[PDB]
Amino acid sequence: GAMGSMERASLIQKAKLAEQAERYEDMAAFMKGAVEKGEELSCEERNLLSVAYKNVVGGQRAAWRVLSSIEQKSNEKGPEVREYREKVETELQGVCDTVLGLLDSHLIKEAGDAESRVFYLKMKGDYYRYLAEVATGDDKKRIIDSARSAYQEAMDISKKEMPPTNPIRLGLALNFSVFHYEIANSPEEAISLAKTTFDEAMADLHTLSEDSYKDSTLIMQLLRDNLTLWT
């Protein structure tokens, strides 16, 4: 890798600089290099990794949806719309494969604490979900089941090892509920998960400090936003 010659600490410092400069492709490349040093990541470092790739793949997803919509409408202008949608789609799949590769080599297998293991398994579910969004082949069902399996393992650990207000647990439930709603075609499961997650967090808020309260209620509001659109 092109980051092989840079110090781990320098890569993390530059990832933070890149974030400030809104240079998310750089940020992702720096964090990939930091992961490939082979040491486990701290909480802050995990979040730098996730923020970086979330921004990169987010730009690709938005572009893919624009092109897919133009393509659907067009279905004569020639092969160009399909070709360019395919180009963006292939780049998106490449980013997802890169993230999944980092998780599989070897972030997940070395993650023993709930906070790290749930975080990485949630990411694995997320990037299989982004692959599922563009999947149309004979692999779509297996991609969907890979997302489900990762989310489910993360859910099982989070329910056993974290309080219901834990922001990682909450964000996992949020994303798994969206997976149910529009990837798995299970809107009822999505609504049930979102409701139970919200209600169990509400009952646990009394245990929290003012700062933790703020962190938890922020994600609870996202659950409520979805419930409002779904019901």
Binding site: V57, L174, N175
Partner: peptide
């Protein structure tokens, strides 16, 4: 497409 809320940066 109507996009629902998910965790982290709303980057798309």
């Amino acid at each position: 497409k109507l996009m629902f809320k998910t965790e982290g940066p709303d980057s798309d």
